[PDB]
Design a protein around this ligand. Structure first.
Ligand SMILES: O=C1[C@H](Nc2ccccc2)CCCN1[C@@H]1CCCN(c2ncnc3[nH]ccc23)C1
Length: 257
């Protein structure tokens, strides 16, 4: 049920290339738009990824980048997922031609928050939530991509700038580390793709965070939006809200402004 016949695929255009592999745009069975992620050899723990791909099949939500299947009878293995015509959210934010309204930015945050509240309702962690791991479709809808994928990367590259103090100190991952990452993601949305702690190294950022210091308010963020994103960064993990509470807060702010 999780396996796709690679012969059902037609490759139309290359979307990206990196140490993770090559991503191409294509069609499934002649008409269905798909993204084909060809995994670089030796880059991933492939047996484990195949086992958990079946679990990822049942994760279905309108704001999750949907997994259609995997091709594992050949090398490189393929991950067949939803096609998102406007690509990476980070690059999308950095394109200044869009002249974004803060209303569109809050809508982006709400998209991501709905996806994350669904994942939380399934007790599934993303473990690498960030704008570089979000995608934008032709309608402008933002969806969460590559959830749980870092568990199978075989590997300086750790997302220090998206990590709470307990992760940086003792590697304690939980739903609250996803919450912290979501706060940093709202920051980078309202900063139009700016790098968190842009004038700091990863080491300086870790020291900054352990000292209790935080990011501060992006210019496009109102007081209520900043309050929402700042609430994700409480030093005590259990004092950080849930994604359901964050969704309520964002909906309230959308109604207010
Ligand atoms: O997929 C990845 C990466 N993750 C990855 C890569 C290889 C193997 C396993 C995971 C992380 C960021 C870069 N990309 C793509 C670069 C080209 C533009 N991308 C898309 N454009 C349109 N539709 C899409 N659907 C899914 C991706 C995608 C995203």
């Amino acid at each position: 049920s999780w396996e796709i016949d690679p012969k059902d695929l037609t490759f139309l255009k290359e979307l990206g290339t990196g140490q993770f592999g090559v991503v191409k745009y294509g069609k499934w069975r002649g008409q269905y738009d798909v993204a084909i992620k060809m995994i670089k050899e030796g880059s991933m723990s492939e047996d484990e990824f195949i086992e958990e791909a079946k679990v990822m099949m049942n994760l279905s939500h309108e704001k999750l980048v949907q997994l259609y299947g995997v091709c594992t009878k050949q090398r490189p293995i393929f991950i067949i997922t939803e096609y998102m015509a406007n690509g990476c959210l980070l690059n999308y934010l950095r394109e200044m031609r869009h002249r974004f309204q803060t209303q569109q930015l809050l809508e982006m945050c709400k998209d991501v928050c709905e996806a994350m509240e669904y994942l939380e309702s399934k007790q599934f962690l993303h473990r690498d939530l960030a704008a570089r791991n979000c995608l934008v479709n032709d309608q402008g809808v933002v969806k969460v991509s590559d959830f749980g994928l870092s568990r199978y990367v075989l590997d300086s590259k750790f997302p220090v700038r998206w990590s709470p103090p307990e992760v940086l100190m003792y590697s304690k991952f939980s739903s609250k580390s996803d919450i912290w990452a979501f706060g940093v993601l709202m920051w980078e949305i309202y900063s139009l793709g700016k790098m968190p702690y842009e004038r700091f190294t990863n080491s300086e950022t870790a020291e900054h965070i352990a000292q209790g210091l935080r990011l501060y308010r992006p210019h496009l963020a109102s007081e209520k939006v900043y309050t929402i994103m700042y609430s994700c960064w409480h030093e005590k993990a259990d004092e950080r809200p849930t994604f359901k509470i964050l969704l309520s807060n964002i909906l309230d702010v959308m109604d207010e402004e």
